[PDB]
Amino acid sequence: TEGRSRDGGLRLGEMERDCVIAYGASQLLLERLMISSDAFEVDVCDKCGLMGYSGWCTTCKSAENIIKMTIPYAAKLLFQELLSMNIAPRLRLEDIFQQ
Amino acid sequence: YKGEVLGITRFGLSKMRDSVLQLASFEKTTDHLFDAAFYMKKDAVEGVSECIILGQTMSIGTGSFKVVKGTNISEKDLVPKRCLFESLSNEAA
Amino acid sequence: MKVLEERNAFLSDYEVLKFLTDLEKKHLWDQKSLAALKKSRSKGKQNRPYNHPELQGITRNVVNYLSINKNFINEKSGISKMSDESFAELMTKLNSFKLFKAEKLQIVNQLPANMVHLYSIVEECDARFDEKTIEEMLEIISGYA
Amino acid sequence: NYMSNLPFGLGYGDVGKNHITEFPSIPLPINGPITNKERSLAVKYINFGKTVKDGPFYTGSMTNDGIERYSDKYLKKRKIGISIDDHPYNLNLFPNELYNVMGI
Amino acid sequence: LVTPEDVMTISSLEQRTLNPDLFLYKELVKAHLGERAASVIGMLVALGRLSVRELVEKIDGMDVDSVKTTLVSLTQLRCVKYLQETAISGKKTTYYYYNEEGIHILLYSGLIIDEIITQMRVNDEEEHKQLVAEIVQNVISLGSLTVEDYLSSVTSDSMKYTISSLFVQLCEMGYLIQISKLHYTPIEDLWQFLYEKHYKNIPRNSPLSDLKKRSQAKMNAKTDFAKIINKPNELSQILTVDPKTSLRIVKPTVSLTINLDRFMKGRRSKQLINLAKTRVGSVTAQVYKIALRLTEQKSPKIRDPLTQTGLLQDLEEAKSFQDEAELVEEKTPGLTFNAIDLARHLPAELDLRGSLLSRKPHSASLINSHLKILASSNFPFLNETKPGVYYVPYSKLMPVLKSSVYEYVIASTLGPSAMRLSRCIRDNKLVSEKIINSTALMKEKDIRSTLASLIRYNSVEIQEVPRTADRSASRAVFLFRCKETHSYNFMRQNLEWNMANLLFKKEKLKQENSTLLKKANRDDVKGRENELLLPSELNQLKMVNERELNVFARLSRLLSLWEVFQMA
Amino acid sequence: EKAIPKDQRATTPYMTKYERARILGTRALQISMNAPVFVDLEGETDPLRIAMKELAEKKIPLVIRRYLPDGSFEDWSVEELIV
Amino acid sequence: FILSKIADLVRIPPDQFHRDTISAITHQLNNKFANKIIPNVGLCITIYDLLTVEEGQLKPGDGSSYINVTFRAVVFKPFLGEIVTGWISKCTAEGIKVSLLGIFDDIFIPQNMLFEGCYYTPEESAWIWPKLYFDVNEKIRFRIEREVFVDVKPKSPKERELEERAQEKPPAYALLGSCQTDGMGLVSWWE
Amino acid sequence: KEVVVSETPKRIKGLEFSALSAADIVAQSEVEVSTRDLFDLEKDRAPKANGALDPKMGVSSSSLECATCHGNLASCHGHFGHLKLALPVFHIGYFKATIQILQGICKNCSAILLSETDKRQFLHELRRPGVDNLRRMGILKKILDQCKKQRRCLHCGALNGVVKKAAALKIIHDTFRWVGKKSAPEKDIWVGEWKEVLAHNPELERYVKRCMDDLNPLKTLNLFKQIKSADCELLGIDATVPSGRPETYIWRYLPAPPVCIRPSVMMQDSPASNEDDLTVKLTEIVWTSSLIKAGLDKGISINNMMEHWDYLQLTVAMYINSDSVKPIRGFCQRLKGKQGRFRGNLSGKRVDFSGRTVISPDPNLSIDEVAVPDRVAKVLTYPEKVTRYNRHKLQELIVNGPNVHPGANYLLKRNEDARRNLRYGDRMKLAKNLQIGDVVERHLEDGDVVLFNRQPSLHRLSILSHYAKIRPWRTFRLNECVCTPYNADFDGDEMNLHVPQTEEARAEAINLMGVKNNLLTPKSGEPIIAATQDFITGSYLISHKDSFYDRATLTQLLSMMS
Ligand SMILES: [Mg+2]
Ligand SMILES: [Zn+2]
Ligand SMILES: [Zn+2]
Ligand SMILES: [Zn+2]
């Protein structure tokens, strides 16, 4: 929340984001902006870059290609808002490993 | 470095970035997003702005390399072992 | 996860027995697991934070199915007492008996002392051979018996 | 408040349900009774396509044991297919890049 | 209330977003050749012009050999067009189009061999019917069927003599045309290749200006392109050679491929005959069946002589091509026939005795009477240039035929008052909200109900009348328009999409019945289907077989609807 | 997708500040996950400080995979990276 | 019983950094492949050995070692010419439920490819023959012809919710037997 | 059974932006919204089927069930619903796109305004391996201008002219823009048609002016559906995948957002729940769609439906982007602005485990330290995991509890998913039962890595990392030497303190943003952390040449120095 009477948090603006980038602290960026603000474990289908629920793609109705990852709830909200308009921001995934 | 003087103005930022997330975060969100959706743009997630928006690790600073733990496994304990029936069956032909 | 190839090298049903036996002796001992231990590992997740569920059962079931007496008829386990030289002394017959078939893994562990057994193991056997080379095979596969 | 925009020819009962018929329904009269000629057209149709699929022009395909059973020894072959290069064709009507697949 | 899971499976919503041009041909190749061939043809339809490497980098089949084999199969099937455009500063690579008319061969296959069977003057012999059916089936299934292959195939000489006998006749009807380079290259690219040589053949410093050199270049290009298309469109040079002490023979070296132009001329004649049967009683409608049958063989080009698809039509003085088409129509003396010419081809069944009544035996005077009523009828079937000899025109019959068939398809779809409003908006140009009442005189309620039901299609156009400078259609009354072009455009798309739905249904039934179909289409099983089959399974087989028969009947009944909108 | 062989290497033999910070973070996370430590703690409980002590003793069992922009990579152990 | 080379990515927690790498890898691989059935590859018992062990790479948030490892694992794969000695445990008039000591039991046999004369009854009479039969829980002998992998499983969350509230093809790997030849069905028919 | 299950960690490689075709909108949607009523007095304001607030699209409160995933507000991801629009309408975000598409083609025969062999050179140029956004726009603009120049189409030249919009939100095409002193069959047809009109209207003589080829959304959808896939590339719409068809860019199905996207607030003003803007707009769109559908089965006045249909063309405009004549907050209003979506929540947001208070000086503090109040040290915690190295320390902290500063507020057991509040539960037992995987959220302690930030954050030294030092008062104290990078002056200045929560972030903070590691500004390399005013004055007074100290004074000076 955004008020002292509401037990609000301190906003880390674009300026502080810029400063942390200039430091080169990627993990601190991740922790301040994703872990400690809004971390959401979304379900993303590998076949269609569309978010699923409860391990179910509910667009191909297969649950086979559903992958689990954490993204900002702001990003999840933005994707669900973009799908409300005629934009389909399909997420393509790749493994961090296998080099 | 593009061969022409490109500004830091909104029009200038549309130089080669192709990052619709970074452009929309900067300015003119809706028109850029709709043009990207209409053109079927396929922008990758490579910039720090997009990485922050998506919750990824940037390729800058502590994210510009990879930490790897050596397995310290010898080559004597990796070859297959205890296999003779296949040799017997092959010699049988 | 991708499986490189389905059909890897075949397994004689003595190699599997000795593999499961060395597994049992290396860890997950059955006589040791049947005993109690109040202290346990003391780390919090078992002896040296590990446990072996769903694997002891499968390494017992296969080894017991092998250790049961071979069903040539309705004294030993049948697979236990052949050493490595015991199977290396069989070449002059096993690889001299031309079968044109990799079905040798059948008669190394099951169905000895019966012509119908072998006639089923290798198809069209009597048409292929029914004169004299149908009994020394039974005698040799029954040699361990 | 958008609730009072109603033409005099439009009532209140019809509006609100919406939801449309799931598929638009207009029975087309091209499904009339069948005759002997139509059955013959169907029969010749099924003979066609089947002929081109039993022929060499499939190009559609994208028990596989490394060990051969003795039953598979001295057993009938499935069918010795006529390869695409095996059937003669006219070089003057095929591009140069397609010549290599063919048997010269 | 229907569930979103319930629709899009039994509703076929996801098939409504496929373009019918891609969906239809993709489904056809799926059914006939295979899924790799269908994927290749779909990539060619979506990307009109591309090379082989484009296929490699676009289709998941990342293999040169596999793409090569599939592409050569499609090229053999006359489903692909190719070209070799040369880049001078380096290496040349050939590109690939997709053949449009070629895929009709496999599509129209049933109607093709049916018109072959029913078109011969001598069809009463059962063995000859089977021979001609098998030969034309082999030609459409193989593509370029060749004499040096078939004669070597047949195992007895006397049945080899008949094969060559049928070839010369079948080529004279035009059903077997000599394939060549003209059948694999795009029309605009041919026109450009014949337009750039002549722009290069003019020496410098001539007194004529750019306009005059452009005119001379374009007329020379037109004349040589016309010669190059006229030479192979109708020829008998392969049939010309005659060996000593032997019958007339075709060239065995050349590859004989079935045509579509004269067959589709016959199909248009057949649809006009059915129109006449629906329009005029069978007494003098019977004479119209063979009336068009003596012109259909040498009939002119139906829609475009291929001089209207390879270039922009015209900007200024654009009537020239219609003028020259009608000029050829009136200048052709072979097409025109007299009553004496027709009497030599009239069947003995028809009498032509009671077909006339002057006041309230193969006689040329009475045939002339039918020909006169045909020429003076409301629909321009014939036009009279000289007394006694007339001809079939196409400079003024195609628009009325298209309007009639389109408008009557609307008649078959919508109701009587919708038909009335369609007729009114067609005949009365630029109708309005008061003109509809003045020229209709029926119930406005049903008038506007059917009108709104008809706005959905491309049938009518809506206009906006701005009472002020700024355009608001809610401020001022608006009027209508016709724009028949979009209406004709819709009848293409809707019909092809419905067709593709038919093939999707049949191929999905095949995909769910493949095991039973494979068990059925076995040599020993064939003809023996009531003995070695379990009860429920055999009964199910009869149900699915009759279901496929019904879908084929629907396909054939629909197959009389899209070509009439496939004209110019 | 091709590792440069160790015998020749073009990247710097010195450890960067980002490499040091990331190595300390990774080692401290491992220690906080109850990984064994190869240094004598002397009563230290903070995983970060234990990681700094191991770095001072050069007993951190991690290597640095430095990817070149062309896609190759050369591996540098924490021991051989000089500070 | 046949081997199989499988490549997988294995995650070793920092707790297991004290034990040697090969043992940690085989522990994790056993946890992933203890009694599991590899989809359309069959049933695994354990892992034989390891072939190639890539260096363990770390993602920027975990701290565990993720190792690309290649291993051979023991798989129960009859194809067509295998005779087995099962232990039947259930009898039903659709083909007897032949079973094992507990390795895997869900396999079924149809009567039509079993001996023709053997027929089931509602009165629970074992067999009717033109001269000998058997009872439940006794040695059997059969063959294998074809393998059907059940790998189709579309299950929606709300359908699973209704199934849970109310509370089938259980296996991905089964076996099909046949007794077309004399002898198989029992190991003690004569002598 | 127990088939093998494989999990492989993955990252987002890229984004594919496109349009949801009509098929995909119903594919994702778990319900259709048809009833214009959100609640009925009959059901007692309980959300029931097919309404705008149908629970199958999600819940607005944490004490309700979704009926799609059966989860409360804290678990339901939200689910979509679709609208079937009778007489589909234009797309505001795709209005410019549709204008440019209709320029490239002729509306007569649905054929592109490009010669089948002229622009294929530039089409081949498009497949260059190195192509940028500037290049894409360059060839696309060149194609558009060439199509504009091309008047007559190669299939049917009807003089395609301009596709300028209405003086509204309509499209009007000048069929005869470039005519003069010329006679054509089309011109003769038009002249005859409007002679038919002039003889039956004594006043339309003036009003026949303008009235050019107007392009309605229904016509455009029909004309777009006649476009072949072959010439889609030259329109910039890749038709390889389904939904690459241009007709999918016309508003036909409305994917009504999940309830979580448009939460319905509880107990504002009236006891009844308050809806929100997007819900109201989709309710009104449902109402007008139902009205227009009802007009198809009844035949309402065509002029009157044009009123309602044009309102549909409008009511969606500020539903998506509020531009035309204004407080109505649409979708594009959510994303645009300083407090919008991107700049307000994506790049920059509010964070947990942070504090802010007045700053006071502290010279006895190390330059790399900050003095943190015990009052905020007892709320700002670090989630320390229990290991073999710190278990006794964490047990002592747990026994201390949340009220004595060297204590802990929460405990998270290894095998549990909810943390145990340490206010209750006899923390003696929890300390005894502490395992080697539990997480203790213990109070901020001495030596804890914290971030310290003063706004405005001009340069990167506006935020530095210090070592926490727990002190009794209520201010953030810092050494005056480190005031310069912050630009702080103890005049009432307030600075924000952030506590990193993970080991990697904490190590990165103290190693890259530490005060000791950032004594020089990166802009020039000159030192920026140094002596302030009184320190400089005292140093000058000590080093002054008149300063002499005996042994006792010197040793006292050195003792104060240390
Ligand atoms: Mg101040
Ligand atoms: Zn999916
Ligand atoms: Zn839900
Ligand atoms: Zn045109």
Task: Please tell me about this protein's structure.
The structure is cut from a larger assembly and holds eight protein chains of seven kinds. Chain A has 99 residues and is α+β, with helices and mostly antiparallel strands. Chain A has helices spanning 14-23, 26-35, 73-84; strands at 10-12, 39-45, 51-52, 66-72, 90-95. Chain A is globular. Chain C has 145 residues and is mainly α. Chain C is 40% helix and 2% strand. Chain C is built from nine helices and one strand. Chain C has helices spanning 15-26, 30-33, 56-67, 84-88, 91-94, 104-107, 115-121, 125-128, 136-141, and one strand at residues 3-5. The longest helix of chain C is centred in the N-terminal third of the chain and has 12 residues, at 15-26. Chain C is elongated. Chain F has two helices and two strands; from the N terminus they run H-H-E-E. Chain F has helices at 17-32, 47-57, and strands spanning 63-67, 73-77. In chain F, strand 1 (63-67) and strand 2 (73-77) form a beta hairpin. Chain F is elongated, with a radius of gyration of 14 Å. Chains E and H meet through helix 2, helix 10, helix 21, strand 9 and helix 22 of E and helix 1, strand 2, helix 5, helix 7 and helix 9 of H. Strand 1 (3-5) of chain C pairs antiparallel with strand 1 (5-12) of chain G.
Give a short synopsis of this structure.
The structure is cut from a larger assembly and holds eight protein chains of seven kinds. Chain A has 99 residues and is of the alpha+beta class.
List keywords for this structure.
part of a larger assembly; 8 chains; B: 93 residues; mainly alpha; 40% helix; E: mainly alpha; three-stranded antiparallel sheet; 54% helix; transcription
Could you give the topology of this structure?
This is part of a larger assembly, with eight protein chains of seven kinds.
Chain A: E1 10-12, H1 14-23, H2 26-35, E2 39-45, E3 51-52, E4 66-72, H3 73-84, E5 90-95
Antiparallel strand pairs in A: 2-3, 2-4
Chain C: E1 3-5, H1 15-26, H2 30-33, H3 56-67, H4 84-88, H5 91-94, H6 104-107, H7 115-121, H8 125-128, H9 136-141
Helix pairs in contact in C: 1-3
Chain F: H1 17-32, H2 47-57, E1 63-67, E2 73-77
Antiparallel strand pairs in F: 1-2
The complex binds magnesium ion and zinc ion (3 copies).
Strand content of chain C: under 5%
Largest interface: E-H, 78 and 82 residues
The gyration radius over C-alpha positions of chain A equals 16 Å
Per DSSP E runs of 2 or more residues, the count of β-strands of chain C stands at: 1
Distance between the ends of chain A: 41 Å
Tell me about the largest β-sheet of chain A.
Answer: 3 strands, antiparallel
SS-derived structural category of chain C: mainly alpha
The spatial strand order of the largest sheet of chain A comes to: 3-2-4
InterPro entries (chain G): NA-bd_OB-fold (IPR012340), RNA_pol_III_Rbc25 (IPR013238), RNA_pol_Rpb7-like_N_sf (IPR036898), RNAP_E/RPC8 (IPR004519), Rpb7-like (IPR045113), Rpb7-like_N (IPR005576)
Modified residues (Phosphoserine) (chain G): 156
Keywords (chain G): DNA-directed RNA polymerase, Nucleus, Phosphoprotein, Transcription
Main location (chain G): nucleus
